[PDB]
RNA sequence: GGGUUCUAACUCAGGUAUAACAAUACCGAGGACAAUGUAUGGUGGGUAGUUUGACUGGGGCGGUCUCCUCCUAAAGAGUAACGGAGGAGUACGAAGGUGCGCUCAGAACGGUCGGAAAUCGUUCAUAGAGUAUAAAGGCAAAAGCGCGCUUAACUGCGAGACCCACAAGUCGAGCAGGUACGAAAGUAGGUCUUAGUGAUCCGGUGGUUCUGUAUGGAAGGGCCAU
RNA sequence: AAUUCCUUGUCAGGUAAGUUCUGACCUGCACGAAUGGCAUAAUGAUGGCAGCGCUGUCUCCAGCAGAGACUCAGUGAAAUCGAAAUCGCAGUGAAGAUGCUGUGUACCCGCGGCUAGACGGAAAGACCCCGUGAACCUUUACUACAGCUUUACAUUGAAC
RNA sequence: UUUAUUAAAAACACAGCACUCUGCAAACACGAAAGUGGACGUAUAGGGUGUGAUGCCUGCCCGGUGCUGGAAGGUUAAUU
RNA sequence: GGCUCAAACUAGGAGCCGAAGCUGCGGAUUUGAAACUUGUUUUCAAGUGGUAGGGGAGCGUUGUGUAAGCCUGUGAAGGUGUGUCGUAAGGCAUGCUGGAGGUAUCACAAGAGCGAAUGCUGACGUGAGUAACGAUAAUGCGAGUGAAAAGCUCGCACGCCGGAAGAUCAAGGGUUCCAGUCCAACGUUAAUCGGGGCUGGGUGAGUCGACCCCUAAGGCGAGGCCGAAAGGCGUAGUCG
RNA sequence: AACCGAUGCAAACUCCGAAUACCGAUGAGUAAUAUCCGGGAGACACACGGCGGGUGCUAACGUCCGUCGUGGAGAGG
RNA sequence: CCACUGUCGUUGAAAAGCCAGGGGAUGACUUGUGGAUAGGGGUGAAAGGCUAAUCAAACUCGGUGAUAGCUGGUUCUCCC
RNA sequence: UCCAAGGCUAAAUACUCCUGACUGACCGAUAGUGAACCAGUACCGUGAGGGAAAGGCGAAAAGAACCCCUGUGAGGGGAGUGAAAUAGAACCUGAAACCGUGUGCGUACAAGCAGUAGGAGCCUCAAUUUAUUGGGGUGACUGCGUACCUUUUGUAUAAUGGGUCAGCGACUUAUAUUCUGUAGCAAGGUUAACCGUUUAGGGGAGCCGUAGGGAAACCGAGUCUUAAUAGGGCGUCUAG
RNA sequence: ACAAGAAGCGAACGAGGGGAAGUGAAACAUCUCAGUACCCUUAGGAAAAGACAUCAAAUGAGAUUCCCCAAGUA
């Protein structure tokens, strides 16, 4: 895997970009449809745990 | 256990998107003063990764 | 080596293909941006509804149909996209 | 800020005792040197670990390696040879934009120096010239040549195509903003076009609210430009 | 010339005839003075050339003796080996054929010889090339290190 | 003397010559150091290098690279 | 081979031969097509050379459950023939041999299939009854014993060594030394013989040697010095 | 030297200029098509016979391209 | 004690010998016994010689099933 | 938030020279330990060290009294024992290579991968009213026909490998991940370690799916770029 | 000059003192191999570690060790 024979592999032509965020994960996004396996009706983030 | 062992290079110049993989271009970071404001311009920005090359891409990096 | 008359002459390079020519001949359907001729000079002019670029390649301004004429007082050929 | 001296650290592979080696004591000789530890510059095939390309009518030697133009190339594209020929690794704030205006090379005739040819006048003269730069293809609406004003050699983009394994490369109407020239319709996103080029990594610089390891910052990082 | 390529240089000697030898010449491709120059008695299982003697070295081999070889009795290997009912020629053919084509020849099987072929046996060519192979060696290749050396600090103090 | 087992030689050694180092805890060598050799020796000695009896001798070049000596100037580490 | 109004050449014509091509007949198989509809059936159409390679369907072997089953001394496995069946891998049956185990069916798991790797181990071929039988110092004959004598014992003769091929040791070996007995293997042949097998015997020291006392080179080395550890060196000594 | 008139030649000459080939449109019939997405590859030493060439000597069972057929991987005559 | 020449031997009597000759043979001699130097080390009158039939880096074990873009081999059957 | 420069501290964790009990879709004598056997032996090496081969009579020795040939030998034949003695001690079974003996046919005028398709003759069995078929053996004569593997553009190749036989010998295992099939559940699916009187039952930690855009903050069927609500990029309108 | 101990051997596991290279990077030096092989010292049925001069940043937790996740994430 990265190797193809000897020019400079895909990887290696591209530039790296971007940073790693350490709030993303920490944030969970939920659905609607999910909604169905609280137990009660108050929905906050101990609720959703 | 034993795990498979992301391409931590490839992963930092590959990003999931729903349908492939998206990257940044070439030849953009230095000497831009010869190239003309269209190669400025249309190489700044993301493109997709080729369907030629892209199960490659699946292989260096199997988790995103 | 006898006779001697050999000796190395250095003309062993090239430069790369230009792929230039008619890509869209008369009479087919045309989209406006497509190109029709990529070229050296004006061997083909833009008629009307055909625009020409800073390489002098002629494109389609508007849909229609490419159409090749030799017409004008110089004898030149024509390339021209008639909205058919 | 340098030298002289001293002895008390330290040294003796010096003498006298201690059976012997060593140690110890004293005497003697040196002496803040020498020597050693850490750090540091030099030297260092004494020794180690390695590298020292490919193409190629075998290899070596020589030549070549990227880009552009012509031919080979078989009237679409493409197409090889250590096949035949040449160029490039730049230049220009005008040699770009626009508006306006102009037309060349030569030949002959006449005319001071002055001729074969300088400058002037006349008649023929679709380019036999020019086009910054090789060649090919173009060029009168001139793309060639001048003048005035200028900065579109813009910013955000871009329908659609060419080419293409990818990474790249090429052309592009149209839209928005801000202009330049024009009386205006308009033209202008560099130059007649095709060579004038080099990915990523890393590091620097100009900007930016994006992030900011308890929190506020900051460092660092990200994004845009170079 | 242990050096000289051209080259068997040229001239002299030696031989009937001498690319070697000896003497000389100097036109030293590319001698030369302690990686010593030129000689040198003696010494050398040292190199070259030339003689006497002597010879089966040879013309040109002959005879003879012993040990094998050959036969019998006893013991009893070897390498090799896809399988063989294993001929010549001219062709053909992965390009030099016992095996294919055409043709010629040839009754079956031993023994003593022989080595022209079976691209005969033996050793995964040592020559040549290749492999991002190895080793060892060299250096003003690179990068290190030992060793040697420089200075600062420490062991390390006092006075003028 | 030598390539035990294809090379015995013109190769190595050799007496002799020269240069150079070394003042003694010598230079130099083994060693990690202690401890050794050099040497229970002492510059007529010991080490390294070259040459190689003897006879006649051994020319010129210090630009390069070494080696030895010198420090006016330039540059220059740690450290501060 | 042979061929000359051809069995040569040119131009025509008519027959025929000639392939795994085409057709005829029988059978299998892939894909698609109308339906009792999963091969439930009858067909039809187009296909079915094949390396690398991709896809599909199976055979056999060892082991587990099925199985405290079923088979088996009226003969298991294995071996060796024969017949028969299937497209194949292969199945079934059975004669003989054998003498105590085997395994239907369906799943499940693999040390699951060999001709090649100058593959590994064992056995056995070819060469071939061929080379050779190990210094060319040499043997002949008469008796004896014996199953058998060129080789053993005795005898006469002959030849060889004799600064050894004769004697004494050290080293090394370890019973090979002597006698009786045997001849399978060993001895490059035979063997009655032997350094072979088997069974007994044999080595007697104050003076020969070792041990012992002493030390050389060189070891080890209370304390001692040095060194991450291990250890290195070293004095007195103690070995040698 | 030129200029006129006859007369030849050229891959890097062209006042000209096919056949094919290529890019499109329309239309029948025939055909186990074309395209896209994904799983698994193998291959990237090719060879000869034509045709058009370069190179060589219009030499080579030579070499390098293009193009077709066969072999590769294909028996049979 | 050596090893200069030749024949033989080359699946040898012998993994270096025999035979006929050859060299040194009071010396830088030959030899017995014991001891010392150990692997990037030793030793070398120097051939990269020798260091247990092994030497441009011994042998044994271990890392180790080193790696090998190379060569060889790769085992039942049928259908597309 | 906690107080270094004082010292301690069980359990849950790691392991097997071993002792006991028990187990195995582990091997079965080329396997399994190198070693089922007098094996770390023989043997090789100065040494460190390397390192084999080699199991089975029979239920019970009842292991063959005695006789005969031979050398009081080996070996055998009788007798006897035994269910069996081509179970007789080299002993269960006894394959192949390889070597003999017997019978039938062919073969000494004919050129080659040794076969194949035909095919005369001969020999031998079973039927049959008696040479007519069928089965078996042989193969005169004719046609065709240059092994296999590997590697190659291409091999009968005079290119590689194999003397033969027998036995062994090469795509595995663990984990991660992706796609396909199948099964269960299904906008949900599933637990892991552990506990457990242990394939159950519990354990929801976690993982995947259900939303994307953007470097990110952030927003979210949207989002990013932008001055732009324009354009464009990436998404959207289920099955996991 | 008197008593008590030690010595040496023997599986693996622990702690500690030293510490490669083959290999991979399709070369190779940073890096990897790997703190592995090996050498050396030494213990116990285990050893080590162990009670906060530790985390956390939530509504806080509360020594050491070991297992599954977190996560092939940062």
Redesign the pocket.
Known sequence: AG??????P?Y??????????????T?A?V?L??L??VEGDVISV?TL? | ??????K?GA?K?F??????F?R????????????????????????????????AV?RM???? | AHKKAAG??????????????????G???I?????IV??????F?AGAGV?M?????L???NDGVVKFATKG??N?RYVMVEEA
């Open positions: 190797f193809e024979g000897g020019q400079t895909l290696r032509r591209l530039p790296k970009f971007g940073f790693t965020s350490k709030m993303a994960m944030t996004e659905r449809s999910e169905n396996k101990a745990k | 256990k034993v795990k498979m062992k992301t931590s992963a110049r990003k999931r998107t729903a349908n492939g998206k940044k271009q070439a030849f953009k970071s230095h000497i831009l003063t010869k190239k003309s404001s269209k190669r400025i311009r249309q190489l700044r920005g993301l493109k997709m990764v080729d369907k030629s090359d892209e199960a699946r990096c199997p988790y995103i | 190395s002459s250095r003309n062993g390079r090239d430069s790369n293909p230009k792929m230039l020519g008619v890509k869209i001949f009479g087919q359907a989209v406006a941006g497509n190109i990529r070229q050296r000079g004006t061997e002019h625009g670029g800073r390489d002098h390649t494109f389609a301004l007082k110089f030149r």
